[PDB]
């Protein structure tokens, strides 16, 4: 309700110290605070955020607060929260937080629901804006509205919320069961809750590829109920966070969760997109022999041109040492694959959720034995072969689960985009007239802003930009102040 | 009717290199195997302005096997490989007007000759090509400037004054390339003042290979001055993200090793521009121990360089201490005479970008009291009279990879050229939609992602790459077809 | 005495699990256990070890035990011990351990002294020393030699030597904490038994030294005729110096920096002071994650090598104000002074991967007038100067960052180093009869043969699926080597 | 022969221009010229050199000349000579040259013999030999020793030895072309003057050998008591083996491949046979341009090093059918056999960066029954087998690809190697009085000191803007070295 749910408020001092050190490099957020803390462009805005509550995220939240917004926050992953970062926010009254490291899936959805719940002075209401990372906040909202419509239609709790199985007879994921449990609970309390939030919702800014995919599907089906900004596809996000962020954070995660030396090992990177590219650079950097799997012939060729062998998993599963999933897809590592792996092979996911690796199938395999090697590291032994595989973070984000995620510099680039997106959505609220238009679309930030995010971080690294002369600008057909590239330029 | 090349006896070496090159150019080999019977380009007259290398010979061969009649010239005075040209002439694949080390005057005469076709209806009459393969926009330029010249000629009933003067609108000397093109245009106005406009009737399009040429097309498009449909081949993912990057990673080094005697390891090498070309150049240079310093105007590109461990500086701060300078900007005057006077003894300067304007070669060659000596073929050392310091320029400021070496290797050129053939087939198959009886405006388009992915598929076996195939469930999960395309149109790879 | 001093025996199960996972890659130690567990080549040997008590070290200790030795162990660094690794050893009765993470300097020397103290098997009421020593940095070797010196000076004047009671050195400056605490132990032992150290010499047959720094100390003693036992330089085996030092640090430096330094390494100017075997590895790792590495070096050959790998080579004074992170890998003293740290930019990070804590002048920093310090996290402190109000962040109080903020080198390379250690211990033990102390024998430092050096490498090839080519009889004759090696001359540098 | 045998004297101007540009980076040679051109330490010395006559070598020759030596030179490889470099030397009277690009093997040995032949300054109508030899591969050293053996066998039976007339060896197999052509020269010299070779020994004071292969031959002669003159192993200087061999090949292999192989290296599986100093460099370069390097190796230590740098290590048999390009860097024989080449895929490229032409079995390939060969370009031949109709493309007939298809290593690293050469020549010349042949004196192979090795590196620091740090008196004492070095022990591997 009014008060936060965190692990330990006494960790606040450590969180505040890390925030100040992190700000040395997060110049984008620091500049936005300096430029807008007086004018308060977000004054009066109620912002709910679902995003890994790390030290870096604390600076984002602080920035939103300095710009005048009231804030409620939760994490987008059960293992990613840094307790000292959460405590710092609560200690300084920057936001109302519902997050802690090592949440149960049930608590995850309760926290998200709590973060979405705001008290109207003199009754309940929702947020004005949403910062989402993976689409869970956006999902609970849309599924909540659907549940309420189905509830009024038949005057009973929808049967899909009570069943433990899906349309095809398979067990629902824990995440779906726990969300449904929350939705059912809210239908019993107030069946106009979700639709009531739509009146004041002016938008959502989505951080990731996976979340953007869900938004684009809803958009094309006429089911998106609020404006949305795709932050992921800003050049200063997808080409930095996804690539250079993972280059460092994958290693940090592997070094903490995997005791073995990476040098000389055959490490399979499944997927060679923006994340995979970064993972491969990092792994090579410390002597690993990277093997790539890929479905896209263009991405496969890119891997080959960087000197990496490109194979189908079946041909290298028995001899490779470590497997890293970076596909954003489902079942890229099956139970059948894991049974063919060699003794003490390590398996990790840097992609999304926990379905890239079939963790459910592994945990529920008949007669399988499991032991905790350390926090968030489990060794599974098959009964017939007596061979074992070691899974990091129960198949969830290894960089945020076994380590602290991306470092401040690149997160400042991603989060500067987030703040700019929130400001865009808020400044455009007058155009959101639900007595007229209710089905909305997804847009991206302009190239001008994209270049601006980069400008804001040049001094951190002592970068000196060259300035075009009037003649040069005319010659390459651009303004001296940009933008410098066409909209289709790939960097 | 007959070709102008250096030496037909080099044909055998050219044919041997073509066959070895085809081992890796599987895209072109597959197109030949798939379309040599159906002849999708049957009857098409294709004029090409593109570095006549062994790789280009396979492109030309592919177009010929698909049924086209061909006339070709190079797009750069130093890039032609004489054995490649001879091979084409020897086998009657095409009529060639190209040789290594052309004068600028001969360059434009060759281009004009390549654009000139004898009409098959009336053999005593002249006509133009149906399609154009252009690399830098010179073929597209002479066409548009030719039409302008003819309109101005009819208006005043005399040779336009801009074609006779040696100066431009601002009083500065015209570039040699402009003077020599103007000289050709003047000559053609005297022979036939309806030549260029007469070619428009049968022109169905141009497929442009490079960034620089695409820029010229986009300017014409926005001013309503583009006189034919165009396909931007450069911006295909299988071209800009491979040829420009990985091609230059190898070909820049080849060029530097041939033109620059010095060791690259430990040297401070400035790469001006960190776009698709600059990125590749930097990887290659680092790969052999150089300490790469990047200059850039785009803050996003500058940050990318920094994230790969490269120092990013303004030229003024590193010009006196750096050892080698490589221009990869596609811009003008990035290395001025004032910059070269501050450089250290025997600093090397090269351009991998475009034309010869990135470095102010004109200003250097015409500097008062400057001394020049030929170090070797296409390598000149300039000594300033006051400081007595020297700088060494590779290829008179023209493409170092194609001037001092043989350009990109077959594999990546097959990817670029597979796109070219597909573009030519697209333009030819769409002929009926080109209606000039109206005041139609032409635009620039790109090939589809389906074809872009196809180009990549065609080259996977060369390198033993094994693609994974999506299951029906996976395809639904990431919202794509099992056969693609696999990425949104805005995806940057 | 009889029982171990560790933090928590209940952590044993986690330690045993990590040991088994680590053994998947430590094939050298696994092979030695399989080959010698029955014959017990070290049967009856009393071995004292001073070496970072990590999981990897636990497998070394286990190997020595399986080969028949009785063992007492302590760590060679106050922060490097992994408590679960120590517990595993105590739980299985493999050794008597005196080690825990985050020891005080006083406790460090007490633990070392305890590890060196053995109950004589003939008369249980009497004390004796070890037969062999595994040393990492030379502290075990130092306390022995300084102990003997102290005892000789004690008999000469029949009183406690004045250098052991004073808190100052010969020049009037404060003694290092490590010296004060060792002296405190030596004084205590002179009062208990002034023939303790010389009494250990009768049964000491050798020491196998793991590091460059320790080897330097041995070579100095050797040249002055002051080395009191045979010694084996393990560091200079090719399978140690060219792997552990280089590839080990390439991974463990990063692990340490990622845990202690919250910042992104990409695009940062990171100064690596020293470009030896450690520096080379550090630079590869840092570059691998996008850092712009700047090297400082005193050796013109090493400086050129750095330049050939694309690194700028500068003197610290010219880059101290603009660099972001500083890593000392010199094995030298005062490479980063207080004056240097005052010129650094806000929140610059400083770390040491070299030795002890004197590469960076931590004493001068901590004792600077009016300096403020705050704990950022475990083993990470931010120091703020009073005049400029600028701060610097020091990792592990200037001690080994890879072992202090992380878990040190991974198993594979430590197996290579430790396979050399076991082979050295076996060499020293098998040669005991030749150590005749009834004369004024002078001891020297030797290295393991190339045959054994190649053997260590052979033992680890299968781990990584490496397939060796075998020479034909003609090829072997052509390059003038035996089909079974060794394949290189003694001066070959790899 | 008084006059030189070169291709074209008119190329002299281009050679002189390249020499001056090259000297910008060859600071070692430039410094030796500046320091010794007045004192002439080599005054009166007759120096014969057998070493790739490149622009870099021209600066070496110029340096020797400036130091006072009279010079005769030939190349050590039939394809390596740069004609403009040779012309420059002849044009300026720096030396008498017997070299040109694309020599026949017969002409190679005639040129070497001519370079070894000097007109005696006492009696101009009589012959004598050189005082000193600069050798690269050991051919100059070989013809001398085989010449002496031939003369001894000639006097013993008073007839031409039968091994010099036969075209076969002791086992009935064809002698290599290099042996036949050398024997043809030796036979010719026995008929003219059977005391020629032994007569040269009176005035021979030494040979400085540039390469690993040549050093091996010297070490064999040394151990058999058959070395007839003092020798200096230049290869094993740190400033040679750790730079020239590694960083030189990193650039020159690529240059050679780019000129001889039309294909793209990126994404190709390129097998590097041998991972020594040359192989290491080759692998870095190849990776640098996107190749996927696969290493073969016989030394388990070198194999592990490759693995730690991320390279697959395999036996050739397991990858020969699927790899694209093969580079031999072993210094061994028959590492690529005819059976291997028959299993290779269509248009696979094969090259050697090692030595001579026996790493790849070129003889077996060229003489294979029914094989077809075509010249693709200068020094590039495609061989097609008759049964499979598959082809393989061989660069430079299996000889040094970097010097055959390209111009060899660049000036900076050659200055480091050649500064060592000049210092070696000065050492041998200054020691001439100690060569007393009135006894049955046995000669040995020695190396230059670490002091000089460090000096070579110091001389090249300014070229690259390297700033060395200087030790304080306290630091120097702490690490036990002199402020001015040497900084490392003799066994240090860098
Ligand atoms: N091209 C050049 O300019 C150049 C430059 C320097 C050295 N070299 C020559 O290159 C050769 C190698 O020099 P190096 O300094 O690397 O010598 P090295 O002794 O350092 O390396 C040779 C390596 O080859 C391995 N080897 C031997 N036989 C083998 C076989 N049958 N299969 C696989 N591996 C095998 C050895 O184990 C060793 O690791 C020498 O002949 C040397 O003279 C050439
Ligand atoms: N070996 C080769 N053969 C043919 N074209 C090549 C080549 N190597 C590179 N190229 C082409 O050169 C193109 C840009 S260069 C053209 C720039 C400008 N017209 C000039 O000459 O200065 C690239 O898009 C690439 O496709
Ligand atoms: Cl645009
Ligand atoms: Cl067919
Ligand atoms: Cl800088
Ligand atoms: Cl002061
Ligand atoms: Cl002097």
PDB file of C-alpha atoms and ligand atoms in Angstrom, chain A residues 462, chain B residues 311 313, chain C residues 269 292 294 312 322, ligand 5:
ATOM      1  CA  UNK A 462      37.592  12.215 -23.151  1.00  0.00           C
TER       2      UNK A 462
ATOM      3  CA  UNK B 311      41.140   7.037 -28.774  1.00  0.00           C
ATOM      4  CA  UNK B 313      40.485  12.944 -31.262  1.00  0.00           C
TER       5      UNK B 313
ATOM      6  CA  UNK C 269      42.155   4.567 -19.967  1.00  0.00           C
ATOM      7  CA  UNK C 292      42.293   1.434 -23.717  1.00  0.00           C
ATOM      8  CA  UNK C 294      48.371   2.351 -21.269  1.00  0.00           C
ATOM      9  CA  UNK C 312      50.755   3.325 -25.652  1.00  0.00           C
ATOM     10  CA  UNK C 322      43.757  11.699 -17.120  1.00  0.00           C
TER      11      UNK C 322
HETATM   12 CL1  LIG E   5      44.170  10.822 -24.456  1.00  0.00          CL
END
